[PDB]
Amino acid sequence: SNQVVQAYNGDPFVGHLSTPISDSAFTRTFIGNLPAYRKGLSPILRGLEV
Amino acid sequence: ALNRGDKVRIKRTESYWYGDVGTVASVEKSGILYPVIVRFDRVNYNGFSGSASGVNTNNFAENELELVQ
Amino acid sequence: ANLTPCSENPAYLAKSKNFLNTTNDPNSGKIRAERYASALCGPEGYPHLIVDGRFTHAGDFLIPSILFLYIAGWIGWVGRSYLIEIRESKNPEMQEVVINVPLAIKKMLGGFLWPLAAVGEYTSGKLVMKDSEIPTSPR
Amino acid sequence: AALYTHHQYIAGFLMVGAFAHGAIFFVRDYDPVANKDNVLARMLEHKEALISHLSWVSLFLGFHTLGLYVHND
Amino acid sequence: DFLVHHAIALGLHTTALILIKGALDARGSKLMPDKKDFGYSFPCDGPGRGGTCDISAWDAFYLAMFWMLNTLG
Amino acid sequence: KVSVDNNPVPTSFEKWGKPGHFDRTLARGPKTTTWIWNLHANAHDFDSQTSDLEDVSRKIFSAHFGHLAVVFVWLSGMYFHGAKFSNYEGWLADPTHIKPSAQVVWPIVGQGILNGDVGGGFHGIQITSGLFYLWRASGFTDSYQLYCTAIGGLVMAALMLFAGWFHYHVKAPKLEWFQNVESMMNHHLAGLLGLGSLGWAGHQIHVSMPINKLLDAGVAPKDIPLPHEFILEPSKMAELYPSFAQGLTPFFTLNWGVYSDFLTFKGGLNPVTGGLWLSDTAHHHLAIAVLFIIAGHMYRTNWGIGHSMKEILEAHKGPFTGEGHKGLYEILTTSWHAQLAINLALLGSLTIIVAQHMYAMPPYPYQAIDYATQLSLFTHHMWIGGFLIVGAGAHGAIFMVRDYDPAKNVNNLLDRMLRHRDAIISHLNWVCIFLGFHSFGLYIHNDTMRALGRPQDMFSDTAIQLQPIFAQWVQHLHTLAPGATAPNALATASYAFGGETIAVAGKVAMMPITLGTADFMVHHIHAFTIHVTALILLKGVLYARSSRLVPDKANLGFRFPCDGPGRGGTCQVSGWDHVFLGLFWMYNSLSVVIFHFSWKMQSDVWGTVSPDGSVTHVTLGNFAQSAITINGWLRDFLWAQAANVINSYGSALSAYGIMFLAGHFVFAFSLMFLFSGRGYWQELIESIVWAHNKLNVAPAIQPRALSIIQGRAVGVAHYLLGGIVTTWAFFLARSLSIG
Amino acid sequence: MDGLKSFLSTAPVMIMALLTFTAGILIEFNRFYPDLLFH
Amino acid sequence: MTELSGQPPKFGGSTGGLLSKANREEKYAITWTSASEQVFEMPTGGAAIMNEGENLLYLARKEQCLALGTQLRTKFKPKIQDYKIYRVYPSGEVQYLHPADGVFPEKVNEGREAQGTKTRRIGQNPEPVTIKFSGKAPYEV
Amino acid sequence: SHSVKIYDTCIGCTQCVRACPLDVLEMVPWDGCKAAQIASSPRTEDCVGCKRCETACPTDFLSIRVYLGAETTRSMGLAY
Numbered sequence A: 001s002n003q004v005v006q007a008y009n010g011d012p013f014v015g016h017l018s019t020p021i022s023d024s025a026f027t028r029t030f031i032g033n034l035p036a037y038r039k040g041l042s043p044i045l046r047g048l049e050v
Numbered sequence B: 001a002l003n004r005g006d007k008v009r010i011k012r013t014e015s016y017w018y019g020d021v022g023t024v025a026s027v028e029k030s031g032i033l034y035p036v037i038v039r040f041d042r043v044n045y046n047g048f049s050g051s052a053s054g055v056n057t058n059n060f061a062e063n064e065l066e067l068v069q
Numbered sequence C: 001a002n003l004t005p006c007s008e009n010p011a012y013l014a015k016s017k018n019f020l021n022t023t024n025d026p027n028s029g030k031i032r033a034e035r036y037a038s039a040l041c042g043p044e045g046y047p048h049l050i051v052d053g054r055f056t057h058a059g060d061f062l063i064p065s066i067l068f069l070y071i072a073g074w075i076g077w078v079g080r081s082y083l084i085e086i087r088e089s090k091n092p093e094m095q096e097v098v099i100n101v102p103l104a105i106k107k108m109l110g111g112f113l114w115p116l117a118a119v120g121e122y123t124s125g126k127l128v129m130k131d132s133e134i135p136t137s138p139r
Numbered sequence D: 001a002a003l004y005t006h007h008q009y010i011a012g013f014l015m016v017g018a019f020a021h022g023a024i025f026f027v028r029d030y031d032p033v034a035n036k037d038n039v040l041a042r043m044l045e046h047k048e049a050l051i052s053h054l055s056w057v058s059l060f061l062g063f064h065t066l067g068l069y070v071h072n073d
Numbered sequence E: 001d002f003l004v005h006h007a008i009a010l011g012l013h014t015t016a017l018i019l020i021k022g023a024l025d026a027r028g029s030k031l032m033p034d035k036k037d038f039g040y041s042f043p044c045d046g047p048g049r050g051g052t053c054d055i056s057a058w059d060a061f062y063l064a065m066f067w068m069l070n071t072l073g
Numbered sequence F: 001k002v003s004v005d006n007n008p009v010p011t012s013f014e015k016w017g018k019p020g021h022f023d024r025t026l027a028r029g030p031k032t033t034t035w036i037w038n039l040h041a042n043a044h045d046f047d048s049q050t051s052d053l054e055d056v057s058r059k060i061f062s063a064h065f066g067h068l069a070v071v072f073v074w075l076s077g078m079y080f081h082g083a084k085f086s087n088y089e090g091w092l093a094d095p096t097h098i099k100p101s102a103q104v105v106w107p108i109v110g111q112g113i114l115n116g117d118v119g120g121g122f123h124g125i126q127i128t129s130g131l132f133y134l135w136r137a138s139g140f141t142d143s144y145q146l147y148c149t150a151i152g153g154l155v156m157a158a159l160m161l162f163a164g165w166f167h168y169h170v171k172a173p174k175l176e177w178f179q180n181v182e183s184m185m186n187h188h189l190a191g192l193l194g195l196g197s198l199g200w201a202g203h204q205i206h207v208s209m210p211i212n213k214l215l216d217a218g219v220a221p222k223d224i225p226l227p228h229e230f231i232l233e234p235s236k237m238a239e240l241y242p243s244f245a246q247g248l249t250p251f252f253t254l255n256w257g258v259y260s261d262f263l264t265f266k267g268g269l270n271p272v273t274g275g276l277w278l279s280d281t282a283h284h285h286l287a288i289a290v291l292f293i294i295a296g297h298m299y300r301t302n303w304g305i306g307h308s309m310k311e312i313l314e315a316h317k318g319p320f321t322g323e324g325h326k327g328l329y330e331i332l333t334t335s336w337h338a339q340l341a342i343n344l345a346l347l348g349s350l351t352i353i354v355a356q357h358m359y360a361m362p363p364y365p366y367q368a369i370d371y372a373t374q375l376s377l378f379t380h381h382m383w384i385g386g387f388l389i390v391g392a393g394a395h396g397a398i399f400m401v402r403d404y405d406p407a408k409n410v411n412n413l414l415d416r417m418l419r420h421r422d423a424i425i426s427h428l429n430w431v432c433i434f435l436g437f438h439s440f441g442l443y444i445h446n447d448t449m450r451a452l453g454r455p456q457d458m459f460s461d462t463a464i465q466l467q468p469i470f471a472q473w474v475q476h477l478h479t480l481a482p483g484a485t486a487p488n489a490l491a492t493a494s495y496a497f498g499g500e501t502i503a504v505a506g507k508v509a510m511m512p513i514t515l516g517t518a519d520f521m522v523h524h525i526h527a528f529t530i531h532v533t534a535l536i537l538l539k540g541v542l543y544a545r546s547s548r549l550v551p552d553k554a555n556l557g558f559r560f561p562c563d564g565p566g567r568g569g570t571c572q573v574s575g576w577d578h579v580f581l582g583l584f585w586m587y588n589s590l591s592v593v594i595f596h597f598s599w600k601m602q603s604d605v606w607g608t609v610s611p612d613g614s615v616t617h618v619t620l621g622n623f624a625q626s627a628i629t630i631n632g633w634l635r636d637f638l639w640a641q642a643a644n645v646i647n648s649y650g651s652a653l654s655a656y657g658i659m660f661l662a663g664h665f666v667f668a669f670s671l672m673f674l675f676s677g678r679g680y681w682q683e684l685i686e687s688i689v690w691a692h693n694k695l696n697v698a699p700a701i702q703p704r705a706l707s708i709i710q711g712r713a714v715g716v717a718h719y720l721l722g723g724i725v726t727t728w729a730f731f732l733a734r735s736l737s738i739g
Numbered sequence G: 001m002d003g004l005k006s007f008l009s010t011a012p013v014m015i016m017a018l019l020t021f022t023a024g025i026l027i028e029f030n031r032f033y034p035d036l037l038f039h
Numbered sequence H: 001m002t003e004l005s006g007q008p009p010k011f012g013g014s015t016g017g018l019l020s021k022a023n024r025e026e027k028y029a030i031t032w033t034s035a036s037e038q039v040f041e042m043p044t045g046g047a048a049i050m051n052e053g054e055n056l057l058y059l060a061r062k063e064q065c066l067a068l069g070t071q072l073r074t075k076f077k078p079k080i081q082d083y084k085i086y087r088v089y090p091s092g093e094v095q096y097l098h099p100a101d102g103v104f105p106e107k108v109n110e111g112r113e114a115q116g117t118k119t120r121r122i123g124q125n126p127e128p129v130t131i132k133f134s135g136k137a138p139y140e141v
Numbered sequence I: 001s002h003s004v005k006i007y008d009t010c011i012g013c014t015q016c017v018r019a020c021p022l023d024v025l026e027m028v029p030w031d032g033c034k035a036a037q038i039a040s041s042p043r044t045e046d047c048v049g050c051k052r053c054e055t056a057c058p059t060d061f062l063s064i065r066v067y068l069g070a071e072t073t074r075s076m077g078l079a080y
């Protein structure tokens, strides 16, 4: 539908909401590409970036 | 060995009515532990907070009651 | 005592010339200034009260003392015997919530025999209950 | 001034702690079958007289010390 | 000093009232006569039977601590 | 569309002798003394006595008439005391010099010293409510008009009492008459607010304008024409205003420009009397009347045109909000508590708006000169507003517990707001902690920098300065408003934004209030305390249904002490105890707000004036560099200004000293109920029952201690009473000492 | 008025009438004889 | 018993639901058989549409599951009294918790055992002096 | 976990079982009262210690006691 806020990851019983701040495309591509979260790094490099 | 409506003092030593007199409403059948139904006029601390009253009737034993009639 | 009486105290005689009028009587401060002259004052000019029990100063303490000891006992007896005569009519709870006002007026008038009635109730045993028939708390 | 007030604030602490350890003794370490009819058990038998008379003395001092202070004020 | 010494007698009698009431009702009372079984310090006994907040003897120390600070002040 | 039942309840006096009949558990019998407190705790809980929505609504309507009788007999007492035992004609003879007093004290025990010399030989207690300036604004001249107004008020008090008896026992309306909410809304808009504003616009045109005009000219008392003589002879009104010779005829042809000489848009203040212009307020009430009666035809009742609010609430639904307001029209017409929460919220904010507007635009003649009137009216309306906002936070929770049916409102705004209660409260307390550090830790930081002897590291103006640039820019726009963005306005909206200093009788009415860094820090203190009280009340509203600690909170009720000592402890978890905490936080918030008001207005605004133009204030400008410290708030405000309460014995301001100490007593007495719990007092009271049973005087009403909710309620009641009485005595004695 | 006599004899109205009578005789005794610290 | 058969009810999603304790320590799951498609208020927060037939709802605490069981047994005219509350571990095992005997605990049946029942009054409890250093409790021994 | 001990003064009125919102109490058969049943607490690891069973009990100094012992994730009532 046209509703922009939904349940987090499909199941509506986890205490979270898929929201344009929480689970937008831009958030999960920016927070998920932050050094503490992006895949393929050793923790020494991601600690050095943080 | 009590009738139905005689005054009796309580010697429970752990109840609210300890030394207060009560009227035996009924004595139930033998075999059970506390058969003596005793009713009082002063209610005890019972119920939720802010309740208007408590309970007065109670099942007592035989060897903890002193008959005063 | 080391306290000077108000008949010759210099600070009290300096302060009595401008006592404030309390009531609507415009000479109330002056009659208070001559009423408090019999009392004794310290070095500030205010009337102290000797309370030791000596009868020459009994008007400071003892004369109102027994006066209150009448009235409190009056109230106590009116509050006590009324409860006794509502220990049973049909139900004491409503007679404690709403007042049986002719019975209360009867006790309120008849309460001035309270100390002789107190010795009578203490001798008859109907004042102090026994130490065993009282609903005590568990140890 | 500092020495007097320090020692009074120690003394009030120690009096409260004496009675607090008295209550701990009555909870944990008091047996009525060995202290039978002695002064400790006879102290406990009339506790409703003791704390009611302390209630009377407290109301007696309090009503009239505040009464005289408000009357003076 | 007459009135203030009566005030200190007031604070002493009330602090002794709370502390002796805590020590003598440390074993039990009409609300809960198993306070020897619960221990010295425990929060309450629920909202039942009227609701026994500050029922332990520890909580009588609690109120008496405020009184000791008050009369020492 | 009137639906009235005839004689629902018989009028009888026999029920008055049986207290507690309204509830099922109270009419059985007072077995315990807590029944007495329950008799007052459920006396107005009309939703717990009846559960049919028709008996409770007519009970509410008759209760409104009874409370209206209480307000009318109070207002009658004000006008009667202004008639008989005041000096209103003496104050009207000389308003600048002598001081008003509308209460004479009987000299019995020495309290004749309370009748201070208020000026002109009249003795009495100087009033600070300032309704004398209300009477001069309305147009009262002699005491007989106040006496007949008090008589007519007592007549309408008995009339409202008769209407209450008539509408409960004779002809009581049905539920459909109460649920006609669109007819109620547009009648209250047009016929109550707008029609009342038109009535006062007519009174301000005919009575308040000519009387105050010739009183500003300098006409003595017993020389003013009677107020009806301006209508009986329109020449006496036409000689004061040239537009009254034009008659009614320019009003109907839309020739309103010729009415410009007596319906002005001057603004600012009147320089002669130190209040608002009466022509300005007359034009104002007329404009409010026109706008309200225009808005009083919006809702359809019987003639097709008009907005029924149901499809208004249907039409507002967005992507974030799901189904929108679908269901709120069925909520607000079936539950009185939701209406009470909304009305208490908006009446509380209205009363705070009243306080925040009646100090910078003083609407009454000689009101800004009397500093005691201005300070008392500000702080009293601040307190009434904060109390009603806490009541909004209460009745929201009562609506959640006992008037919220979740089957009717699915995926609407109420269900969606209850579905993310954690995402609301966990950000609200974050901004509470952020504001707490950044409004109080600033105060601790420059307190420490002043105590460490380094004033160059503080948060002062000479130090690191936190200039409030936004409100300074807004003040610049309000100063630049008349001529650019309000061209038909001569003066500004107020002289608190920017402009000249208004001086009337040697004192200062209103000068521009500059905002330094002290006003920055104290406004963030205000926003912080507002956020915390709006945290406790909001998390009492949202967490009243259920939670993760206790998910059975709706079945336990709105007003319960605890769930028990389990789960670590669950005491003060109900929706009632959040109101119990929010009452203290409203007390703290409003105490700091009225402290900021009193200090800023008596350091930067008030004071005497000098003929060369220089202004000397009451505290000589202390708020600039000494309002940024907690020690500065203690030494320069709470120690220096409390000396007028301290040293005032043997004088007229002597009752305020024994109300100062009285308020300290009730605060300290509240701490006994707040700190202690019930079971101690139960264990002590049973010992006093033993000491009564020893003398056979133990009552058959079972005497036992208060409930836990009762103990918290009497603790917060004595706390708020003691703190407000202390602040009342301090503010009144200080501002009566400074003039 | 068989209920008005019971309502005027409830505990608050009777204690208020008794305190009004007590305050009345105290104020009257303090007007006709004021400022009595002792006897 | 070991497998949870049911469909999730219609719900938009909330914040007071399953936190990080569910996939780490334990969670709970209530299964019941509805009659119609009515509306029930879950203890997590807000209302939800109860699906027709056997449906399954995951909760975080047992008290929320029993509060939902109380809401199912009292606040409906078709009184749903055939609900089962299971405890689900992250390992995958499912423990049948309530009404695991088969009949409700409010009424008595044969097959239960008196666990935690004393044979004395509270006034007949022993004193804490005789067991002052045994390490036990005055109510246990 | 807490310890819910149920004494022999219980009259089998089953108020405590229907009051406890955690399903720890349950009625087992007995022969010492008129109702011939007594409450019993097998699932004491689920009891939070709320003492809601010690609000609905008719005996003098209620026959069921909840002694607040150790704590855990269940006895502290934590959803996290």
Ligand code: CLA
Pocket (backbone or CB within 6 Å): D054, D055, D056, D058, D059, D060, D061, D062, D063, D066, E010, E014, E017, E018, E063, E064, E066, E067, F665, F668, F669, F670, F671, F672, F673, F675, F676, F684
């Ligand atoms: C200024 C505050 C204040 C006051 C007046 C009291 C006063 C009292 N406390 Mg107390 N208390 C306080 C703070 C206070 N407390 C605090 C902060 C705590 C810590 C939690 C405690 C903890 C505490 C405990 C633990 C106990 C007391 C007890 C008592 C009473 C006996 C002591 C006494 O002095 O006799 C009497 C003194 C008085 C001053 C009473 C006069 C009160 C007013 C003036 C009477 C006049 C009637 C009044 C005007 C009617 C109001 C009318 C209105 C509705 C219009 C007394 C009523 C004890 C008690 O009640 O048992 C005896 C007790 O056991 N208190």
Ligand code: CLA
Pocket (backbone or CB within 6 Å): C075, C076, C077, C078, C079, C080, C082, C104, C107, D052, D053, D055, D056, D059, F687, F688, F691, F692, F695, F697
């Ligand atoms: C008239 C009935 C009555 C009588 C005879 C007594 C008698 C007594 N009370 Mg008492 N008491 C009463 C009512 C009464 N009380 C009420 C109504 C209260 C609740 C406010 C209390 C609260 C109370 C406390 C807290 C304590 C006593 C204590 C005592 C004992 C010591 C004397 C004392 O300090 O009293 C002084 C009395 C008071 C401080 C309060 C009573 C004040 C009211 C105004 C008296 C009149 C009550 C009533 C309206 C009159 C009824 C008249 C009737 C025709 C309707 C004494 C046996 C003390 C004790 O245990 O001693 C060992 C104690 O600590 N009482």
Ligand code: CLA
Pocket (backbone or CB within 6 Å): F040, F041, F042, F043, F044, F045, F046, F344, F387, F388, F389, F390, F391, F392, F394, F398, F558, F559, F576, F579, F583, F717, F721
């Ligand atoms: C439009 C205003 C309004 C209305 C109609 C109501 C109506 C209601 N409120 Mg309420 N409330 C309001 C404003 C309002 N409130 C505000 C502004 C607050 C915040 C303070 C509250 C806080 C509040 C709470 C906390 C509770 C209610 C409750 C209730 C309900 C029962 C009332 C009751 O039992 O009290 C009967 C009346 C009294 C008990 C009298 C109170 C006396 C006060 C405490 C003392 C007054 C001090 C006085 C001014 C100083 C002088 C006294 C002395 C010194 C001489 C009722 C529906 C209760 C409820 O619904 O429970 C289920 C409840 O628990 N209200």
Ligand code: CLA
Pocket (backbone or CB within 6 Å): F429, F430, F432, F433, F434, F435, F436, F437, F440, F441, F444, F532, F535, F536, F581, F584, F585
């Ligand atoms: C003066 C005593 C006092 C203080 C300081 C507080 C402080 C606070 N209350 Mg509070 N409260 C009080 C009395 C007090 N309360 C009383 C009497 C009541 C009874 C009604 C309440 C009821 C109440 C409620 C109901 C709530 C609060 C909340 C809060 C917090 C709001 C956040 C904030 O301001 O930022 C934090 C500010 C401070 C901690 C004060 C600043 C002090 C400095 C800057 C910090 C120290 C610097 C540094 C750490 C020192 C290091 C030294 C090192 C050795 C450790 C805050 C901690 C709310 C809360 O916690 O949620 C947000 C909340 O909901 N309070």
Ligand SMILES: CC1=C(/C=C/C(C)=C/C=C/C(C)=C\C=C\C=C(C)\C=C\C=C(C)\C=C\C2=C(C)CCCC2(C)C)C(C)(C)CCC1
Pocket (backbone or CB within 6 Å): C051, C052, C053, C062, C072, C073, C075, C076, C077, C080, C118, F695, F697
């Ligand atoms: C003379 C004098 C003095 C002395 C005093 C003394 C020393 C005291 C003592 C006291 C005591 C040593 C007391 C005792 C007591 C005891 C008892 C035992 C009591 C009794 C009581 C009762 C029993 C009560 C009853 C009643 C009444 C009577 C009335 C009302 C009711 C009632 C019931 C309440 C002095 C120096 C101060 C000063 C000067 C003068």
Ligand SMILES: CC1=C(C/C=C(\C)CCC[C@H](C)CCC[C@H](C)CCCC(C)C)C(=O)c2ccccc2C1=O
Pocket (backbone or CB within 6 Å): F672, F673, F674, F676, F677, F678, F681, F705, F706, F707, F708, F710, F711, F712, G015
């Ligand atoms: C003192 C105290 C009590 C005891 C409270 C009592 C005994 C109430 C006292 C009422 C007496 C009878 C005074 C009457 C109240 C008013 C003065 C009545 C007005 C009467 C005049 C108008 C004549 C509690 O029950 C309590 C409960 C929970 C937390 C704290 C506390 C607590 O601190």
Ligand code: SF4
Pocket (backbone or CB within 6 Å): E043, E044, E045, E046, E047, E051, E052, E053, E054, F561, F562, F563, F564, F565, F566, F569, F570, F571, F572, F677, F708
């Ligand atoms: S309110 Fe009292 S009884 Fe309830 S949990 Fe808190 S302390 Fe215990």
Ligand code: SF4
Pocket (backbone or CB within 6 Å): I006, I009, I010, I011, I012, I013, I014, I015, I016, I017, I038, I039, I056, I057, I058, I059, I062, I063, I064
């Ligand atoms: S509530 Fe008390 S009497 Fe009733 S079954 Fe439970 S333990 Fe027995």
Ligand code: SF4
Pocket (backbone or CB within 6 Å): F566, I004, I019, I020, I021, I022, I024, I025, I046, I047, I048, I049, I050, I051, I052, I053, I054, I066
């Ligand atoms: S404490 Fe609570 S969970 Fe435990 S048995 Fe009692 S009511 Fe049930």
